Symmetry: C2
Subunit: 309 residues, 2 copies
């Protein structure tokens, strides 16, 4: 017998936690690593004969799909009472960490106080600072796509399309990863880029003074990016899988998420990092959306039609 996790989270993040869990509990664990979307597909393709016990996803939207598609078991109050925020109405999965969209910038070139209060205002701001050809983005990156989906949810397709086309008119540089983009900010090739907060945290911990800008509370540019896990209906190892979800919400595992990964924890009693906001301040930043139901479908359509993807 082995606990089987299907993970849309990265191996360099998952593996050390799994190894610790194996050592402490004596439970053998096997992990499959794919994208959230590939995991969702495989879980459906495998039907009743899936060996899968848990789905540990990079995104609330993938868990929302798994739930809506009847893959997930309802969770009890013991697990669902643990997180401080983001517990789905479906009560079929548990949020484990949250990450924030932020605006990274070079603080030698831009004063914090002149930065825009809204993402929608970013293209005008970039033209104010003469930044045509001097802004970066990551059009193929999952969280950027999530952010565009939140824009649709808040503002509608037309305003979101308008923004995409305005962004394209800035001649932005596209980077295949967030560290590539942040390196370009450090080098002075671009002066700003929308990214995930923990990439900026990692650069700062390494000694690079990269600016971390938050838009006004509730702005689409601060979208909350919730990760989480659910138990599958197919699970034949429910006690081990419950033990594992418990482990993911423990102070120790949560300290790993904060420290090793740079993400915000969702339980209290975790030591933060001077580069992170207090938890209550972090929770204030995102629009209050149904994160299970972001219109990623419509986001990809717009990104394709506008020439971003």
């Amino acid at each position: 017998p082995t606990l089987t996790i299907y993970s849309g989270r990265g191996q360099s993040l998952v593996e050390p936690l799994v190894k610790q869990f194996e050592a402490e509990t004596g439970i053998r664990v096997q992990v499959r690593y794919s994208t959230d979307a590939q995991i969702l597909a495989a879980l459906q393709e495998e039907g009743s004969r899936s060996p899968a016990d848990l789905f540990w996803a990079n995104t609330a939207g993938a868990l929302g799909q798994a739930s809506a598609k009847g893959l997930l078991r309802p969770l009890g109050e013991t697990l669902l009472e643990k997180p401080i925020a983001f517990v789905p109405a479906s009560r079929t999965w548990v949020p484990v960490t949250v990450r924030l969209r932020v605006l990274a910038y070079n603080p030698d070139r831009i004063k914090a106080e002149e930065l825009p209060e809204s993402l929608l205002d970013l293209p005008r701001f970039a033209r104010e600072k003469g930044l045509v050809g001097r802004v970066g983005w990551t059009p193929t990156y999952s969280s950027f796509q999530d952010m565009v989906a939140g824009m649709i949810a808040l503002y509608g397709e037309e305003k979101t399309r308008e923004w995409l086309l305005a962004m394209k008119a800035l001649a932005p540089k596209a980077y295949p990863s967030n560290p590539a983009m942040l390196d370009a900010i450090r080098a002075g090739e671009v002066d700003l880029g929308s990214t995930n907060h923990y990439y900026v945290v990692r650069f700062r911990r390494a000694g690079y003074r990269l600016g971390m800008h938050h838009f006004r509370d509730g702005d689409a540019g601060n979208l909350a990016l919730v990760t989480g896990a659910g138990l599958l209906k197919t699970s034949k190892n429910l006690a081990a899988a419950t033990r594992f979800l418990t482990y993911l919400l423990s102070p120790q595992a949560q300290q790993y998420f904060v420290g090793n990964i740079g993400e915000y924890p969702l339980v209290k009693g975790v030591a933060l990092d001077p580069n992170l906001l207090p938890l209550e301040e972090a929770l204030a930043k995102s629009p209050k959306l149904d994160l299970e139901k972001l219109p990623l479908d419509r986001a990809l359509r717009l990104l394709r039609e506008t020439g971003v993807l």
Copy 2:
């Protein structure tokens, strides 16, 4: 309940952990942030305006000085049995984390399999590979000076002098901090430099895949840099102070050191980092010196007299 800590560890490291300890226990913690050397001066000679409970030091050498001066309470088997290694011969403080001297290099530009087995042979390697002006060091940095002290213990001053003079013949570049030197390694100003392992870890976590060369087991260039904490003879808050010492060895605190700081833990119940060695491998690297008794003053004198410092 209250607790006074004299910390030679940086505020950016100590503060988040102390805040969580306060929140968790209701013990009000007061911290003095200073250097290990300034704290020693206070504990042996200069005095305090109020009694301190704990010396949380950056270095085993400073705790060893405090011990030699008789300023630390003896600890016994109940506290000292938790750490896996590095319990001091004096048994007057508890080891909390370990860091390793390593050789940072740019793996795009340097072939790992060609790097020397001993720090002593670095100047020859560098001269042969035509790397004059392309080696960096941090002459003013505490851990560099510790490594030089390890050299004096292992080799004597005459051998250490030769090495220092052979180094100087490479026209090495001097950097005010480890991040500055690692940035120069990334940028291409130099190709390698002796540093502490966690600086390389932080660079790798940010996406800059700098190399971490370890010398052969026992080599002076792999010196173990142990951090730790001792109870002072002046301690008025003995209950809170012993509770904190226990806390520093707890799974959550140890996870914080691995994650937030990048150091090696000294307990087994912790999730590591794919950029760290397994624990036993890290334990093999350093020579087996009495870390409480390194000739730090001789190292300082020698660095000043060879004009390195």
